[PDB]
Design a protein around this ligand. Structure first.
Ligand SMILES: Cc1cc(N)c2ccccc2[n+]1CCCCCCCCCC[n+]1c(C)cc(N)c2ccccc21
Lengths: 186, 186
């Protein structure tokens, strides 16, 4: 598939290299596609990017739901999600690329556009977990939406800023975090 | 000095045109130095940059030493340091060159190694706050080294992946997080 070929080489390079490091030229030489290809469903570069992001976001959200069963209580769901957040092959491996992409477009107003609906899925997982926990009486969070955002970002941090040290060490930290966070919620 | 002069000019250059565009040539001519002297001092642009980064870490620490006086108890220092981390990077010029540099050299262990020694220094702050916090019964943490790395990275998370939100909101979420976290240690 050509339309689904660009997306392939793209995600690949955006991960190995940064947002800038990888260029349209490089994709075209490994995916074979003139300017045209990139225009109907692939306008700009930040377009082909915001695309990949959504795909991955869904790939992750899906995997999460197909695996959250191994967790009976929401307290366990919180812990798990965070741990999985470290093992996955979806979305998280593009955080560095995102950090860049943002530090180099936070001017073009059409940024907080997708950067919005995207920030939703990103925190939705926590939103449910937290609200459901309220119903299930595991805790009582009145500012769910906030805690959701905080948890989501703190976790992204532990996943992103320690991406080079022993995976077991990581898993250990993340769990000690999840333990400390939930415990500060009541 | 002439070394100090290269670092100076280099910091500015990096700040004005980023890491990738700054050429050692520019650095050499503007610092009124020479390819040879610049080689003898840093060997490479990457090292030159890491060196600036080190000096920068120093200023940060020194600054934090003055600023933490406004914080009597360790609980307070935790709160302060976090907010500070968020607000100061909002308008930290080098930030862009750093993002660029990291998301382009974390592949190499040579460089990644040195960078971790740097990130460590950041973490030390939290280690001190937590250790002292123990000795004052503000809390009881027996795995300081861990809690420290965790805090550190969670905070980097909230600082990095939120940029796109009203500055106050960001500060609010941060302070909330410091509240939740600090409470889950009791
Ligand atoms: C003076 C001074 C003054 C201030 N007001 C100040 C304010 C805020 C922060 C530093 C400040 N400093 C000095 C700051 C010196 C900082 C040296 C930092 C070295 C480390 C970066 C590590 N890193 C890692 C590990 C992993 C990542 N995925 C990653 C992704 C994107 C970007 C960086 C990444």
């Amino acid at each position: 598939n050509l339309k689904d070929k660009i997306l392939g080489v793209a995600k690949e390079l955006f991960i190995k290299n940064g947002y800038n490091a990888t260029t349209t030229g490089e994709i075209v030489k490994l995916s074979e596609s003139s300017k045209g290809n990139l225009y109907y469903h692939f306008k700009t570069k930040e377009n082909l990017f915001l695309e990949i992001l959504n795909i991955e976001q869904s790939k992750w959200q899906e995997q999460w739901k197909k695996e959250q069963i191994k967790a009976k209580t929401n307290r366990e769901k919180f812990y798990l999600y965070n741990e999985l957040s470290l093992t996955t092959e979806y979305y998280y491996p593009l955080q560095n690329a995102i950090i860049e992409f943002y530090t180099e477009y936070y001017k073009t107003n059409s940024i907080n556009e997708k950067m919005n609906k995207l920030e939703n899925k990103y925190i939705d997982a926590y939103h449910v977990i937290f609200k459901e926990g309220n119903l299930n009486g595991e805790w009582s969070i009145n500012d769910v939406n906030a805690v959701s955002k905080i948890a989501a970002n703190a976790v992204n941090g532990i996943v992103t800023f320690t991406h080079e040290q022993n995976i077991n060490e990581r898993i250990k930290l993340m769990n000690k975090f999840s333990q400390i966070f939930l415990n500060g919620l009541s």
